[PDB]
Every structure is written in structure tokens, then in C-alpha cells.
Symmetry: C3
Subunit: 443 residues, 3 copies
């Protein structure tokens, strides 16, 4: 049930009706691959086995050389620049540091001796879920040891290339990613293995249901950290998202520049709401994501990460209805740049048409059905297939939903251009007023 | 025929002589893969077939689970922040919504019964080109049904792994991309299939010739949208670029900070043209791409996307010759940051040398051939292989082309530092003048 | 030996003790693959060979069509916007332009006739290291020519698919990357081939030791440029990083907003150091990388690229101890945005808590151990596992290292809010003072 409201006064539109799925924590699991510890015959079948065995030996050496250092990563030091700075794999690397302590790998090696899935409590007190997805030790020792110059058939050559291929592909991913990959591919964790991992995960039924129906999103929000390879065990930590906030209301705020509508070049002043992005109710406050491109939207579900959010008071919503309200200082930016553009919303299109720009909305069967005059306007996606602003053609989202046009006078008309602070990049309503008050008194 | 002109007055250079190739629209095609609808024997050849058949069954289940939701995507809400906001796959998803209407898949399934390529007119009136690239139904039913515990040979095991591998790789791409991939890989569409798709495409001969000679660029500007999988048919929409603007003049404007040349720290004022990027003539106006990194340049051809552009009047070119012209208010930024840097142009290098920085240009055989003094200067790529500014070594483009040094006094000398607005991030020539006029009157 | 110091006065922390590894130049090598120049029988083994041979012929045609144009690339025109603009593959493309000169490929073809590794001096005077990694000519001519309708076995079908697979994968990478790939995958250059290339490279023993122990980082800083395919030779240039600066001191400066601590909404003023990023001593100056995410950190080693750096005087370090020092004008930004956030450092966490935000630091075994009051504070990673600011949970880095809390009064208390320039995006200490001095005199 997606609806949309356009606010003509502030040149902004809100698309509400979405449900939340916020990454609040991390789950660390240890995926393992049991390894094997290892002829004059020129047999064309043994030669193919010797070649595949060298690929196995090189991949093990390649991963050992890769891990002689700590898991490498890159970290930092409209309003996205106001965000904090985290360490995404800090939790996964912490689990990996524990696996280097002596005897810790033996605990994992022993727990997975009789089964392939087991919960292990590490030395530092963390209870991780362990998973042995490939047992190359069992295959090489039971099917490739008696052959080494002995009897060889082609069905073993094919089967060994099939099982070893997963190890080769995992090494290829880590070799070009410095031991940290995201999203987590199907070589690191197949769709059946990941689903089985989610089912055995200590989470609520709603979290299992949510993650199982969106495994492709879980992959995109998961990390695979190459960890340790000792004592015939190849272990890499898979860091999975914890969705501590589920099914709370979300809405996407779209904003576009609001300018005066003089055809004369350079005689206009503008005003743009800078608080655009995804908003979701979260624990009394509002989780504001200033860069909506960091969130994934599956149907009416919104997948975001709280690391890319700010925690704002719920009074920030008043900027949609009353941008001049005294409870919250609404963030805006001021510019003299009267350029034309359009913002494709969930159920329509905002059109900021200025200067001498041709702005239209068209249907594919009929052609132009509306011609926008100068100013900031809006059209619903019902009956409209494309929007053109200048030489840019926009396709609108053809999703079902009702739009509401909230009429109101553009607030840019309430400012005297002679004393309007034309170049404020990160300002607010009160901030602009303060500058206007000073410029007035001195006149 | 690439030429270049450096404007000493404004610390900017224009590289002209390029030809346009602008993405103006989209073409949606439906690529299909016909699927098959499906033993005590422990035969080492049947066992390999059973394993590959499970890979086939899992990939189908994995793609069915992936598509139970609408095609997921991420969208927004120097001057790149002035751009609009579109929905890249809005047109492709619209085609996919039609394929879910009942009987629509049967139209595609029937049209591709006797051939592999066919044009189908959908129910909503859109005429799409359909393509059956893989018929696993025909292979499993004619070569793998009588075997199921029957006679098995190794040549069938190898051939089934070859044909099924494309389905497995397509699933791997969609599993780590949430059903939307770009660029379109060769598993989604081989080079011969894409070229055949371009040839059967309803476009002019110039568009066919352009796309065929730059298929790698077309891939980078194309989307692959996993759509529907029902009634033994696996369909995904390939969204291809429409180049409605071809062979119009383009030019790249490079800008660098222009500062006063006092060695004393912090006593300088700067000025930087913010209108840098790719410019292309387009339908009476000028398509300005403020982030030149969004365009691909093959030889003298420039591939851009109008979604990443602004539509400006052609008078914006006057800022290169006369930044003070009254017809267009040229965009600049003002700073006190007198740091040294270089901008590698198409046929040379702009050098902004300030403070106590060592700035040189060298030849690989001889060494330093020029030492830059403080200010903004330029050197041609003829005879010059590298440029050094501080501890940063720049390699220059060794492309053939003539450069022109347009002498002129730096416009930063025309401003009195005592009343110069030192911190304007998104300003213009007129905007700075306005602020100077006010500060003067109050003195 | 990583240590950290937090500066309460300026809301910033420095993590020192790292060692440098700066990309200062490029090394260009020519990797080659010798190609072969090429039946009514329906044999199920010849049919599999005919199919794999068509994959070989199509890949060669696909790469020939890809290279009919010059190697395509995309280039430009907190303080990262102050950086210069280079051409990353300018040096590699220059080597490729030489390979198109007639007779140049024959020099490479002749040098690799009796060996697989050879140093060749090109016509323009550049001495490149050449490497023949795959000889498909020798395999097709000696193992697949007598078969073409003749005797065929399955071991040849498997071996031809193995050798040809590397050519097919290299083509797949170039087809979706327009002939330029980074990082350099293991198909372009295997781990053993790259290590052998580093060993035969004309570099010092320290550079060989550094690159060999961090091959995954070298891959991420290397380019693979598809170059020429003529006269049975497929050549692509691998552009490798030259680390001209090794083992010099580095340190990472983390900054966070410093605001006044009034609970009242919108009554605070802030101040944020904008000079955050990686700093490394380099040749008398300091290489400043304003976007720390461009550097890779392996253990205590920092891998950066001087193309993403500014060359600053060493006096910039005084901003950590005395932001008001007269030797360097420290860069800051001023805002009224009193939002709460945290910055995860190497050995702790900076917490900027403002408004009505809940900011805590917790241990996994015990829970909340510290509750932050309004202002900018810091906690060490010793005994602390997580930090919460609002609805955002941060995991801290669990690396061993001592932190030092340098007490001092926040410099934001030294400003009178009535005359404080609230919206300076790219300002400095002196710049703010200048604006304050003017606003005072007019009062």
C-alpha cells in the first residue's frame, strides 16, 4: 500500500507505506573446508589428476601467503557527510583473532568431526555457528591416495575437478579482494547452505522468515573474511546482518530545487531541502538515511544499514508540512543556480523547470500530455510513462499507488532577493533567517 | 582530430574535436531460456549426471525464490549534485510487470516455438524483441530422459555440464546482484547474440554501426533484469541503450584552482571554475556532464548518458573566452586553500603550483625540461612524458594533437583580497561581485 | 607498535605507528599468449572438440573487435575535491601505442621463441619485461592438428577445455570492462606468474620483499590493459605499482564535529576539523590523503597512491597539538548541525553526543560501562567492544595498542555564538577569525 504526497510549497514529495528491515548488528559464523595433507606414470588420466592436484596445492599456498597479515580493509576518518564512521568487519576480525589462539582451531576441528554443522563456544566467550561445507580431506584420502601411477578412470578426473573447483573459485575471490569480499558469493556459501545457516541461526521466526525470503539482499549486506588455514582446516568468517528493526514504517523524502521563475538569466534565487533520503521509525526516534542509494527496496520492504544513518527526533517530519515550524530547524541549502531537472519519485515525478527549458510529461501511446511552466511542479505516474526536462528523458516508475498534490505557495516567494543569502551550502531555515536579520539591520 | 586550448586567464583548458554518443532512451528485449520439467544405479557416469542435474534443479529453485519480490534497486532522493534523479530500470521493470500478466508468457513461448528470434507485441502495446538463447528443455528431454539407470557415456556428461554451465553462471550473477546486473556479461548475452540482437534491432544503420563497433561500451550501459520464470520459460529483460544523439561536437573542459602567488603561507586567495566536465552539442542546447568520469571515451568518440547531464544554453561556452561576459553567469568557487596540484588533460597538463611546492615537467630520456613558477601554467604533451607536483608523479596522455596556449592575465589579480569572499562553495561571477559590492559600501 | 592520542580540545584523534608503502610510479610489462592460426565426422568426442574450438575462434574475434579502438577509460576534469586529476593508464597505453608500430610485435615474438620470460627494449627506448603465459599455438598445432575426423580420445577433450578456459575467462573480463581491468585477476596473471614477475623485476630487494608478501594488494593497485592481437600473438599490458616510498612513518587523523552542549534544539554552533585522513612522511614534506578509504591497511603497513594525495608542509601536524598556531592555517568547517555520531578509530572511538541522544560504550559480557554526556569524548578499545550512538551500533577494532587521552578545553567554547560564522563549508582558523573580526567592528 504505497502512497505519495507532493508538497508544492517546499518542492518535495514523500513516498510512504514501506516496511523497515534495518541492519542493527552482526552475526559471525565460521565456515570451514577440511583439507588433505599430501610418480613416473605418464598416463593421460593421471596427468589430468596431477594438474588438478597442483591447482589444489597452489590454492592452499596462495591462501597461506595471503593470510600472513591481518585482514585488510579501507575505512574513513546530501547530508551523508554528517554520518559517523565505523569499522564494518571489526566484529568479524575479532572472531578471527580468536581463531589464531592455540587450540581454538582444534575445538572447531573436533566439533565438526561427526557432523557438518555445530555451535562452538570460543575461548573469549563468543558462541559461533560452525559449518564444514567441503571435505577435500575425505575425498583425496579415500579416492585419490591409492591412485598414487595406479589405475585411473575418467569419472574420477571429472569428479575431482568438480569438487576442487569451489576451492579454486574461493581463492580467486580472495586474491582480488585482499581476503574480504562483499556480497558473499555462492562459492563462499551456496543458497542451500545459507538458507540452512539462517534456519540454525539463533534468531526469531520473523528474522528467519525475512532473511530466507530475501537471501540475495542478505548476501549484499554480508562479508566473507578469510581467516585462518592451519591443521588441515581452512576457515573463513562469514559476517551476516542482524535485522533488529523489522516492519516499522518507512518513507522516502524526495527534494528538488525551488527557485523564482524569472526567464531572465541569473536573476533567480533558489532554495533546496537538504534532508532528503529514507526515514524509518526506530525506537522512539527516526532513523534518517541521507543517501537513499545505500538502501535496497524489495517490493514495499526497505533494507538499510544503521551505520549509514542519523538518529533524529521525530519532529523532523514537521518539515514536510510546516518547514517554518519552531520545533525543528529544517535543513535547506540556498543557491543562485536556476538549472532545470527532474526527480523520479516512487509514484510520480517532481519537475523543477526554470530558464528556457522544455519540460513535458508524455504517454507512450499519445505523446505529450502536459507542458510544465517555470517553477516546481509534480505529475502522477498514472497515465504518465515518461518525463522530459531539457535533453534528458526520464522513465517513471509504473508501480500502483495513489498520489496526493498538496497545494501551497512556494516559500521562495517569501524572501526578498536583495537580502537573500544566495550561497549557503549547509544551512537551515533559522540559519537563513539569522543572516537576513543582520543584513536588514545594516540597511 | 583532437585539439586543445589552455586559458591562462581562468586556469582552464578545453579539449575539443570529439564526437558524441549520448544515451537518450532505452530498448527492452526479452531473453529466454526454455526449461525442462522433471534411480538405484550407482554408475560413476550417472552419478555425475545426477550431480549436474541437481545443480540444474537448485538453480531453478534459487531463481524462483529470488523473484518472489519485485526487481530490487537503489536510487537517490563538481556540479554533479545539481543533477536530477531517475529510475534506471523503470522501463525494463515496466516490461517485466507485463510479463506477469496471464497469457503473456504463452505469447512469448509460442512465438519462439519454430524460431529463436521473434518480435512480439505485448498486451500493453509494447513491441519487444524476444530471443531464446538456450533450450535446456530440448536437451534434457531428447538426451537425458531415456537415461533415467540406463546406458551412460562420458561424452554426454561433458556436454550436459557445458550447456548447464551458462544457467549456473547466470544464477550466480543474479544471486549476488539481487536480480539486476550491469554491465551485461557474456553469460546473459554472448558477443554473437548481442551483435545479432543489434542487427535485428529497429534502429538506423548509423546506430547499428555504432553499437556493433563498441559492444563493450553497450554492455557497460546495459542492464539485465531477472524477470519471470513460469511455464518452462526463464525470461530476463535486457535493457539496452538508445543513442539518439550521434556525431555531434563534444569537448572536455578541465579546470584547476587559480590563486595568488605569495610564498607566505595563508596569504593567498583562490578562484576555481566549477563548470568542468564534458560538453556536447545536443538539439540547440548543450548537454553538460558535470562529472566527466561518468563518460567513456573510445578514440575520439564520447559515450555519455543524458541522465547524468544538465541542459544548458550554448552561451555557457563564453566562460572559456570571457568569464566576465554578461550573457551567462559563469560558475566559480572561492577558496583560501592554496595547495598545489595538476590536472592531466587530453593533450597536456595544467599545473597549479603554489606555496613552496616543486612542480616540474620531464622527458623520460632527458629529465626535467621545465620548472613551473608559482601560479597556474600549462605544458603540452609534445616532448613531455611526466609531470611532478610535490610528491605526486603524473603520466601525461601520449595522444597526437596540437595544443594552443591562450595568454591572458589571471583574473584573480583583479580582486582586492581585503574584500574578497574567501569561502563560497557554489558561487558565480555575479554572485561574488554582489558580495564584494556590499562589503565595499559598508567600508 | 600502534598507539593513539585523542585531542579533547579539537575533537580529533591520531593513530600513529604505521609504516608507508606509497605508489609513486608504474611498471609496464607485456603479457603474451601465443595463438594458433587455423570435417564430416559426427564423433561425440570430435563434436566436443569442435565446440571448444569455436569458443577459441569466437574469443579471438571478440578481442579483435574490442581493440579496433584505443583503450577506453573514464577520467575527471573531506578535502578530496582539492586533489589533482591524473590519467591512470597513460603510461600503460603509451606502451601499447608502441606495440602497434610495425615490427614491434615481431621483436616480442622473437624474444619469447626459446624462453617464456625476456626483457625487450622497445623502439621508443622503453625496456619492458615480456612474459608468454600460454602457448595455445604449440598445443593446437601439436595435439589438435592431426585430429582434423581422425582418432579422438576424452583426455584431449578435457585438456583442451582446461587450457582454453584461461583465454575464455580473460576475454570475459575484457568484454565487461572495455579492455581495462583492475584489480588484475588470476586469469590475467596467476599468483606464481605474478610472483615470478616481481622477482625478475628491476627493483630493490625491499621492493621485491614488500610486493611478494602483499600480492593481493599489488593486484588491487594494478591495471590490465588489452593491447594488441596480431601475428599469432595476443598481448596485453599489465601496469604494476612502483613503491618508491617504503617504511616511512604514517598516521591516521580522525575528526568529528565539536559543538556546544545545549540540549535546546538548534541553539548550538559547531566546528569540525576537515584535515582528516592518512598522513605519511615523504621526502621532507607530508603526503596527505584526504580520503582515507583510498588506502589499504595490512597489519601496520599502509598502502596508498600519491595520485590521491596532497603535498603539504610538515607544519600541518601542529593542528593536532595547537590548532591556533601561526605556522599553519588549520582547515576547519563550521556548522549549526548538532547531530550525534561516532568515529571508530584504530584503538578506540570518538563520540560526538549532542541533543537528546543516548551515547554509551559497552562490553559484550557486562553491558553498558560508560554513558557519554553531551560534547565530544573518547573511549579506548581496551575493555570496550561496542559503542552506541542513537540507533547505530558500532563495533570497535580489537587491535592491541595504547591510547592517550590529551585533556583540553574544547575550542568551540572560545567563540561568541552571536558573531560566529555558522555556515563555512571549506574554511580555516584564520578564515573564521577574519569573518569574526569584520562582524565585530560593525557592531
Amino acid at each position: 500500500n504505497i502512497t505519495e504526497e507532493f508538497y508544492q510549497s517546499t518542492c518535495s514529495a514523500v513516498s510512504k507505506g514501506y516496511l523497515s528491515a534495518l541492519r542493527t548488528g552482526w552475526y559471525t559464523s565460521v565456515i570451514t573446508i577440511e583439507l588433505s595433507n599430501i610418480c613416473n606414470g605418464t598416463d593421460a588420466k593421471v596427468k589430468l589428476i596431477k594438474q588438478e592436484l597442483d591447482k589444489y596445492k597452489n590454492a592452499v599456498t596462495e591462501l597461506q601467503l595471503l593470510m600472513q597479515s591481518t585482514p585488510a580493509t579501507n575505512n574513513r576518518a546530501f547530508l551523508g557527510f554528517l554520518l559517523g564512521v565505523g569499522s564494518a568487519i571489526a566484529s568479524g576480525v575479532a572472531v578471527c583473532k580468536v581463531l589464531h589462539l592455540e587450540g581454538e582451531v582444534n575445538k572447531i576441528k573436533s566439533a565438526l568431526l561427526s557432523t557438518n554443522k555445530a555451535v562452538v563456544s570460543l575461548s573469549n566467550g563468543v558462541s559461533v555457528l560452525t559449518f564444514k561445507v567441503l571435505d577435500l580431506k575425505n575425498y583425496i584420502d579415500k579416492q585419490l591416495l591409492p591412485i598414487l601411477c595406479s589405475i585411473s578412470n575418467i569419472e574420477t578426473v571429472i569428479e575431482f575437478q568438480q569438487k576442487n573447483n569451489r576451492l579454486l573459485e574461493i581463492t580467486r575471490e580472495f586474491s582480488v579482494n585482499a581476503g574480504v569480499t562483499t556480497p558473499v558469493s555462492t562459492y563462499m556459501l551456496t543458497n542451500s547452505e545459507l538458507l540452512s545457516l539462517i534456519n540454525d541461526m539463533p534468531i526469531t521466526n520473523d528474522q528467519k522468515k525475512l532473511m530466507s525470503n530475501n537471501v540475495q539482499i542478505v548476501r549484499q549486506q554480508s562479508y566473507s573474511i578469510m581467516c585462518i588455514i592451519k591443521e588441515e582446516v581452512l576457515a573463513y568468517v562469514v559476517q551476516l546482518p542482524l535485522y533488529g528493526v523489522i516492519d516499522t514504517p518507512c518513507w522516502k523524502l524526495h527534494t528538488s530545487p525551488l527557485c523564482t521563475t524569472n526567464t531572465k538569466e541569473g536573476s533567480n534565487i533558489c532554495l533546496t531541502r537538504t534532508d532528503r533520503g529514507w526515514y524509518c521509525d526506530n525506537a522512539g526516534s527516526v532513523s534518517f538515511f541521507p543517501q537513499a542509494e545505500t538502501c535496497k527496496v524489495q517490493s514495499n520492504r526497505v533494507f538499510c544499514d544503521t551505520m549509514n544513518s542519523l538518529t533524529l527526533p521525530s519532529e523532523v517530519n514537521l518539515c514536510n508540512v510546516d518547514i517554518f515550524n519552531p520545533k525543528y530547524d529544517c535543513k535547506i541549502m540556498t543557491s543562485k543556480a536556476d538549472v532545470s531537472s527532474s526527480v523520479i519519485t516512487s509514484l510520480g515525478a517532481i519537475v523543477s523547470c526554470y530558464g528556457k527549458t522544455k519540460c513535458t510529461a508524455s504517454n507512450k501511446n499519445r505523446g505529450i500530455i502536459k507542458t510544465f511552466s517555470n517553477g516546481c511542479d509534480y505529475v502522477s505516474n498514472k497515465g504518465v510513462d515518461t518525463v522530459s526536462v531539457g535533453n534528458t528523458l526520464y522513465y517513471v516508475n509504473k508501480q500502483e499507488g495513489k498520489s496526493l498534490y498538496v497545494k501551497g505557495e512556494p516559500i521562495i516567494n517569501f524572501y526578498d532577493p536583495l537580502v537573500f543569502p544566495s550561497d549557503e551550502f549547509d544551512a537551515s531555515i533559522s540559519q537563513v533567517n539569522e543572516k537576513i536579520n543582520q543584513s536588514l539591520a545594516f540597511i
